[PDB]
Each structure stands twice: as C-alpha cells, then as structure tokens.
Amino acid sequence: KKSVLAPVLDNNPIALQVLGVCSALAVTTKLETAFVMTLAVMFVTALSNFFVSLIRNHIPNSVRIIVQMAIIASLVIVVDQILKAYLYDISKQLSVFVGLIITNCIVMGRAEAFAMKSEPIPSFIDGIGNGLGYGFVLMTVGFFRELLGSGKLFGLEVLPLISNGGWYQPNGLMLLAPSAFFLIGFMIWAIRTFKPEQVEA
C-alpha cells in the first residue's frame, strides 16, 4: 500500500520530478479533461510498464528505445480510438495532447527506470502509483482553474455567474496559460513546506 502511494507527495512526477508538465499545463482548464487525461496516463503507464517488463530480458539494447516507444505508441493509439468512439466531446477538447502521452516523460521515465530490470506486477503497480500522483497535480490545478475561471466543477454550477443572474465574476486569467504556471508553482511551495525534505539547495 505504501509503495503505490509513494509517487504522490514523496517523488511526485511534477512536484519533485519534472515530468508530464506539458499535459498538466494544457488540459487543466476543466476537471473533465483533467480527470479523463489522468485515467489515460494510468492506463498507459501501468500497461506500458507491464509489457516492457515481460520482454525486458530479450529486448535488443541497440534499438530498445524504438521497441519501447512502439509499445507506448500502440497503447496510446488504442486509447485515442476509444476516446473517439466514446467521450468524443472530451476527446475533441484534449486535441493533440492525447497523442502527446507518447512523449510524456512519465511514461518513458518509468519504462526505462523501473519497467526494465523489474518484475511485471511491481512495474505495473509502479505505473498505477505514478499516474495517481500525476493525477493529484492535475486535479488540484484543474479544480482551482475550473472553479475560479468558470464558477463550475465538472460542468456543474457552484458559483452562479453574474451573467447567468448570479453574483460571481469569473477570473479570466484562470483560463489562460500563466495561471497553470502559478498554481503549480504555489502548489510545490505548499508541498515542500509540509515536507521540508524536498527543499533544494
């Protein structure tokens, strides 16, 4: 239980490590895209690690990079087809970032570092945990941006907008690029205050 939850506030892919930041900055305007994206990253990281481990002892070292990206690319392509067949609306919103899961440093980072020279099941759990931490960052950033940028959570009204006979004026910077940078930056500050072991020198 401790192993799976480790990459959440101890070796989080975005707070301690710098991995999967491109998605965390681009699909966090709504929780629906942030939620579905994280589930995909767990599906790919867990499965890519599992398959890499099984054929790790036989992978050719010369072209191991090609062999690994093929597994990830195949899985991400399948995930893209599923999102089109079901959840086409969300799939359209994610745009080119569903395919960018391939280059997501989290997927490759675990694949080379852990899926290799490891057993399948532990490597699978390694992927599940990493996505959970990656998902935690996407939820926190996505929660604040959607709530303050639109007055809604998961598309549900939580703050009636003055335009819709409400009382809350939306903040337009929450829907733009800089806000995601600030939220993660302040998110890191909070984590390293309650866990001062992560402070850099």
């Binding site: 010369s62 072209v63 090609i66 093929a70």
Partner: protein, 406 residues
C-alpha cells in the same frame, strides 16, 4: 481489409526505421577495441572493448584503483590522472574534485565511461597492489565494541605500507550471528546488559570495506589491526547490524580473509615541529603505528603527545603499551579523559571530554598552538567538537589531518 494494410504498413515502417539505425551503426559507430595506456608503459597498456566504466577495465588488469564505495560515485577514492581522453570533467565529478585538480587531469574513474581511446597516469601506489588472503591469528576483544585483529602474511615477509595506511578487506556472502562472537568475561558482563547476541547478521552479498593498519613498518610478521563492531543505533533499532565487522568479529584463528593490498594517505610530515595525536575508538591504530614509527624507526627527538578519548577503564586498551613508551621516552606523553567513569573505576584524573580537557590543560597556555600537527581520528562527535575548538585557537586546516572512521 484495411486491417491488412494497417498491419503491413505498421511493420514496414518499424523494419525500415530499425534497419536504417542498424545500417547507420555499422558505418558510423567505430566498434574497434579501445586501447588504454597506463603510465605510457607498453606492457601496462590495457586493451578493453568499448563500453563500461574506467574502473572495470583497470580492475581486471594488474592496476587496482581504490574505491571505498565500489563505484557508488560518492567516495572520491577513484581519482586517476587521465592525460588524454575521457572528455570533459562531469559536473558531478567537480563535487569531489576541486577546479584546480581538474586542470591536472584528476578524474573519478568510476564516473568515467570508456567510449574511446584514452591515456592514464595512475600513480605507483595504485599500480603497486597485490591480492593477499592472510590467515586470521587473533580476534580478541580489546574493549566493549573494539577488537584487535592479527593477520598472518601468506607468502612471508610483510605488507609494504607507510604508517597510518589501510587495507581494503573484501569478504563473501555469509550468515554470521552475534552469538558466535567470543568475548572475555571482563567485557562480556557489559555486553549482557543489552544482550546484543540476539542480533543475527545476514550478509546477502559480498561487500568491500577499509581498515587502518595498527603496526609500524618494522613490525614484521603480523599486520596488527583494530576493528570496531558495527551495530544498529541504540535509539534506531530499524537498521541492519554489522556486516563486515560482524563477519570479521565472527572469525577466529584459522579463518582467512582477503586484504587486496594496502592503501592510505594518512601520513605525517617529515619536519622538526611538535606533533599532537587525538585517537578515538579504532583511531588508536594509526596512532600506535605513528608513535612506534617515530620513537624507534626514526628516533625523532620532536616533542609528541597523545590524547585518547574513552568513557570507562574497560574501554581503555593499549594502556600498558603507551605507559612503556611514555616511560621509555620522555619526549612522548599520553593522557586520557574519562567521559563517564564507572562507579568501580574511582577515577581521580582528567574527567570530561577531550575537546575541553585538552584545551583547558595544554593548548590554552600553549605559546604557539598553530605550530603543531594535529592528527585526529575518532567518533564523528569527537571530530566535530574538536574541530570547533581547534579553529577557535587559530589552527590552519592543513595542520588538521582528520581520518574519521565513522
């Protein structure tokens, strides 16, 4: 229908991609074997295939490079002079190597990858390394957590080394239990207070460790050593017990262990100035060699002193040896400060810690404390406390030769 096209095209791209990479590798990457030159000697030249770290090729050959961490990258004992090759010094290498040393070719061998031809200028000491497996003679307990180790030289003569050196000991995997440890009744009584015999060390894989010598060069026949048992912290039981020291402690007469030759840099200066020795725990080994070396091997007339830190009388070993040397030569003197004498000790001498006993007695009124060489080796707490006092006396770092054994 389209699935057939999808399958065929999918493979054709991958096969084309790998073939281009593999085809490019043959005509672009030179697969010829690398040639490594050591000190420029044609015989010492080492030919190793591309790939792997520098220490790998050197270890197989007749030149052995000291590596306390065994390639861990955080020991600094793999410093070698790379005249040519090896690229530029890595940013991590600068952590253990100063900028000035980098200009001289000082590089971490374990951190350097052999990917092309290179030139090396390994020193004579690194070149002059011989593998020996001495037969353990004595493993008596000098103190509560200290043992005196006697080693029988396999091929006669004695290990060639300078005073204060160490021998890198390597042992295979074994399960040694603290019960097998043999202790005298004098020290066994204190052991029963905590009953450390319940521990059971399990050395899964071979390990490498260093142990300072405890015999000056003229002491031919036995490579005397002092070993301190490694145990989990009393306040932190969740730590593995001693692995190498426990294995060595478990040994007795008849057992043999490898020493991989001598190494070290804890050498005194050949000058005409006063010398100060501050030993602790296993640190008594270099002091005994240094004291023996100066008194008889060199017959130096320079003033000498010794300040060993101990807690109780039972801890204090080699007391007779120092008393004889002190009586034998007036220039050499020794004193001990008891941190916490036992009720039966009835101590009536210096009491407390040496970091204050030494200053309040000798250094405080010393005319020129800076004009002294301070050789210190002991527990980390002693080293930290003593360093602050010596700095407060205006003592240059060059005159403080710390040799902490952990």
């Amino acid at each position: 229908s389209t699935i057939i096209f999808g399958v065929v095209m999918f493979t054709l791209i991958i096969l084309a991609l790998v073939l281009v990479i593999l085809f490019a590798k043959s005509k672009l990457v030179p697969t010829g074997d690398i040639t490594i030159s050591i000190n420029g000697d044609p015989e010492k030249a080492i030919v190793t295939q591309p790939g792997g770290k520098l220490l790998t090729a050197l270890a197989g050959a007749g030149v052995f490079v000291s590596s306390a961490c065994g390639g861990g990258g955080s020991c600094g004992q793999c410093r070698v002079k790379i005249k040519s090759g090896g690229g530029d010094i890595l940013p991590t290498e600068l952590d253990h190597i100063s900028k000035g040393e980098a200009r001289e070719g000082e590089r971490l061998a374990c951190q350097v990858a052999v990917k092309a031809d290179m030139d090396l200028e390994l020193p004579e000491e690194i070149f002059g390394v011989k593998k020996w497996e001495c037969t353990v003679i004595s493993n008596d307990n000098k103190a509560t957590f200290i043992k005196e180790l006697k080693l029988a030289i396999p091929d006669g003569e004695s290990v060639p080394f300078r005073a204060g050196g160490y021998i890198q000991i390597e042992a295979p995997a074994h399960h040694v239990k603290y019960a097998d440890f043999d202790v005298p009744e004098k020290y066994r009584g204190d052991w029963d207070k905590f009953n450390l015999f319940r521990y059971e060390s399990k050395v899964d894989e071979p390990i490498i460790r260093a142990y300072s010598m405890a015999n000056y060069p003229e002491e031919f026949g036995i490579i005397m050593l002092n070993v301190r048992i490694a145990t989990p912290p009393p306040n932190n039981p969740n730590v593995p017990p001693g692995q190498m020291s426990s294995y060595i402690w478990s040994l007795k007469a008849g057992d043999k262990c490898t020493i991989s030759g001598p190494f070290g840099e804890f050498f005194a200066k050949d000058t005409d100035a006063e010398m100060v020795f501050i030993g602790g725990g296993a640190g008594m080994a270099p002091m005994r060699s240094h004291i023996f070396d100066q008194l008889k091997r060199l017959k130096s007339k320079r003033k000498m002193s010794y300040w060993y830190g101990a807690r109780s009388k039972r801890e204090m070993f080699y007391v007779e040896d120092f008393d004889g040397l002190a009586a034998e030569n007036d220039n050499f003197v020794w004193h001990c400060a008891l941190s916490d004498p036992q009720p039966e000790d009835n101590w009536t001498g210096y009491t407390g810690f040496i970091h204050n006993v030494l200053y309040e007695n000798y250094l405080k009124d010393h005319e020129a404390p800076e004009d002294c060489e301070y050789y210190m080796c002991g527990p980390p707490m002693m080293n930290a406390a003593v360093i602050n006092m010596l700095k407060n006396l205006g003592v240059e770092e060059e005159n403080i030769l710390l040799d902490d054994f952990g």
